[PDB]
Design a binder for this molecule. Structure first.
Ligand SMILES: Nc1ncnc2c1ncn2[C@@H]1O[C@H](COP(=O)(O)OP(=O)(O)O)[C@@H](O)[C@H]1O
Length: 164
């Protein structure tokens, strides 16, 4: 009953980047974890688009049914004052019109810049040649100058638990 933190389940992708599940999915994973620490989260029950994937809480891996391949997952934690504590989410648009949430650490940084009335934010130190402009609400590649739309939604807060 001492410290409060935000649960963010993340999965490791081909670019060695920890990608976050949505808040809807993270609440579902936690609900399964509370019941049995050796359980298996059928992501298809909460998200029909994640129907091939299974989260094996024993080995802490994302399991593919049809192929058998695995990707490491993790139950990561962030400050309750950050964006996942409330459900603030920053997403960018690809060529096809689909919106994709930033990495959780970058997403929090964007929200920190925004609320401080920072005109823009530079992710070069973070390992991203990208520049985010809040006035135009757009992202720009520092090297290629290519731009993409930016948006911020109020989705669902990520699960919040207590550290003793
Ligand atoms: N939990 C997830 N949520 C959304 N997309 C995912 C997830 N896990 C994997 N992907 C996407 O699936 C693609 C790779 O397919 P994957 O299911 O990992 O099998 P394999 O790596 O054997 O091709 C990656 O580009 C990744 O972006």
């Amino acid at each position: 009953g001492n410290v409060a933190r935000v649960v963010v389940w993340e999965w490791l992708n081909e670019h060695s980047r920890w990608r976050p599940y949505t808040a809807t999915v993270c609440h579902h994973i936690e609900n399964v974890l509370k019941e049995d620490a050796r359980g298996s989260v059928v992501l298809g029950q909460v998200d029909a688009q994640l129907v091939p994937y299974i989260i094996d809480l024993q080995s802490m891996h994302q399991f593919r049914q049809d192929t058998g391949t695995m990707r490491p997952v993790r139950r990561n934690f962030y400050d309750p004052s950050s964006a996942p504590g409330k459900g603030i989410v920053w997403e960018w648009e690809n060529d096809g019109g689909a919106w994709t949430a930033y990495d959780m650490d970058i997403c929090i940084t964007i929200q920190n810049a925004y609320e401080k009335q920072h005109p823009w934010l530079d992710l070069s130190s973070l390992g991203f040649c990208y520049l985010i402009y809040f006035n135009s609400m757009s992202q720009m590649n520092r090297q290629t100058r290519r731009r993409r739309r930016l948006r911020r939604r109020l989705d669902l807060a990520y699960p919040l638990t207590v550290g003793s």
